[PDB]
């Protein structure tokens, strides 16, 4: 988070938190309630988001292992979509990409290459999920949510 | 029903049914026996029509809600197909599209938009059902069925 | 424009504009610089918006008449996208959806059904165009542009 980043920056220089860093931390603590409301909206609507986004993703990217007749593959893909929607909600709670990066961006390419799942298909699915999510968010809330989708997409692109 | 059509036509003019309307009524009531046979054919082959039409429709449109690995959605779509075959059988019995229009056409777009089922896919499925149903009757029996399937397809587009 | 709407509303009652109408008129003319700026942004970036929206839309809908190997169909689709951006710019200038509605929304379903362009595909293309266009607008400017894109999308579906 930004709190952790500021504390680490202050610690490196063996100094207390400067007034500017404290002002930044205070601003994010003020915005915490709004971020919590946005994340609650994301969590309460995650099932519709995943349903619509998965239908769109199988329409646009049909040649994918989840869309291959295997029930297990389809179930795992849907579980992963729900997992990433929830992770984006939690990282919205925090206010920075650090939790989502630590849980599901660092090493995501290696994990899905070991699983033999194309990462471009994942990029397409995240794009569809982002579109569906943006459909049900205000522009102001989208300004908070979309960059995490973009961070995930960038971390997934080979 | 064509009988209701004749009665309401006479009523709009506040006159008794004219001899032409009586002639139409007599022809319809004497073709009712063939209409019952067509309705029985549709009823007894409903599952075959539904399965074959679903196979063809998923060949054309595989990425559809009824073919997304959700068993409930598949069951609901195939039940809808059976229901429309049922309504077309009703219309064959009644001699007009009024049963089909009143039960499954008025507000069909609104209902399927609320269900988030794209209407193009439903039109394609109706076309496949129409072909499957026509492959089970002679052309004379199939005139009415083709007309009613076209009516359903036009209501969705 | 909205001025025409106020004038016609006053004329319907055969009376001079009421204080509420004059207040609406003044509020509208107060925002002329902002409307002109938004229209300038839309006009300058029309081709970039068209290109980005086309790329996204062909990613989302691979089997569409635009993306079917016919260069004329692709050119016509991109011209349609540009024309709709132009109509949205007109609407932003006029303060109401009247230009867009009168030029490219009334009879849009009939025109695109005659051209055999599926309407769901056009709705998706409009969604991609809206996402590309709103990225160039500040938060103050995006309200009317998003509303008019939504107006087109609702007219199509």
């Amino acid at each position: 988070s930004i709190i952790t980043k500021a504390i680490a920056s202050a610690d490196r220089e063996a100094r207390y938190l400067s007034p500017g860093e404290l002002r930044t931390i205070r601003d994010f603590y003020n915005g915490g309630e709004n971020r919590l409301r946005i994340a609650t909206t994301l969590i309460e609507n995650r099932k519709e988001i995943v349903e619509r986004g998965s239908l769109k993703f199988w329409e646009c990217c049909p040649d994918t292992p989840s869309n291959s007749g295997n029930r297990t593959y389809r179930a795992s893909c849907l579980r992963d979509q729900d997992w990433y929607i929830r992770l984006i909600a939690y990282t919205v709670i925090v206010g920075d990409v650090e939790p989502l990066k630590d849980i599901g961006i660092v090493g995501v390419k290696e994990m899905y290459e070991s699983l033999e799942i194309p990462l471009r298909n994942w990029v397409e699915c995240i794009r569809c999920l982002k579109e569906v999510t943006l459909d049900l968010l205000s522009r102001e809330d989208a300004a908070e949510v979309t960059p995490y989708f973009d961070c995930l997409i960038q971390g997934m692109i080979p | 029903s064509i009988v209701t059509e004749l009665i309401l036509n006479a009523d709009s003019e506040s006159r008794y049914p004219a001899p032409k309307e009586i002639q139409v009524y007599q022809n319809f009531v004497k073709t009712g026996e063939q209409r019952i046979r067509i309705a029985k054919i549709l009823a007894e082959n409903e599952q075959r029509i539904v399965q074959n039409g679903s196979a063809r429709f998923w060949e054309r449109v595989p990425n559809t809600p009824s073919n997304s690995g959700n068993e409930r959605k598949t069951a609901s779509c195939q039940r809808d197909q059976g229901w429309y075959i049922r309504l077309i059988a009703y219309s064959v019995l009644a001699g007009s599209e009024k049963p089909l229009e009143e039960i499954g056409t008025i507000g069909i777009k609104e209902m399927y938009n609320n269900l988030e089922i794209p209407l193009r896919n439903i039109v394609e499925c109706m076309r496949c059902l129409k072909e499957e149903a026509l492959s089970l009757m002679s052309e004379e029996d199939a005139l009415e069925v083709s007309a009613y399937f076209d009516y359903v397809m036009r209501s969705l587009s | 424009s909205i001025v025409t709407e106020l004038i016609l509303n006053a004329d319907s009652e055969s009376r001079y504009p009421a204080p509420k109408e004059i207040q609406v008129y003044q509020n509208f003319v107060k925002t002329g610089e902002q409307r002109i700026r938004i229209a300038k942004i839309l006009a300058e970036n029309e081709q970039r918006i068209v290109q980005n929206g086309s790329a996204r839309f062909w990613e989302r809908v691979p089997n569409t008449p635009s993306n079917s190997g016919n260069e004329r169909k692709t050119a016509s689709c991109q011209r349609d996208q540009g024309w709709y951006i132009r109509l949205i710019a007109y609407s932003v200038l006029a303060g109401s959806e009247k230009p867009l509605e009168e030029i490219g929304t009334i009879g849009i379903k009939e025109m695109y059904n005659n051209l055999e362009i599926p309407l769901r595909n056009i709705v998706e293309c409009m969604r991609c165009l809206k996402e590309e266009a709103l990225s160039l607008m500040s938060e103050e400017d995006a309200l009317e542009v998003s509303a008019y894109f939504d107006y087109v999308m609702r007219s199509l579906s």
Binding site: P62, R71 | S54, V61, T64, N67 | -
Partner: peptide, 26 residues
């Protein structure tokens, strides 16, 4: 307990008709 081969049992009818195909293919 040096043997674990009994726990490595790894982890049917297709759930989709006509898989891995695009809609409205010419």
């Amino acid at each position: 307990s040096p043997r674990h081969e009994n726990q490595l049992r790894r982890e049917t009818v297709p759930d989709k008709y006509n898989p891995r195909k695009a809609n409205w293919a010419a």
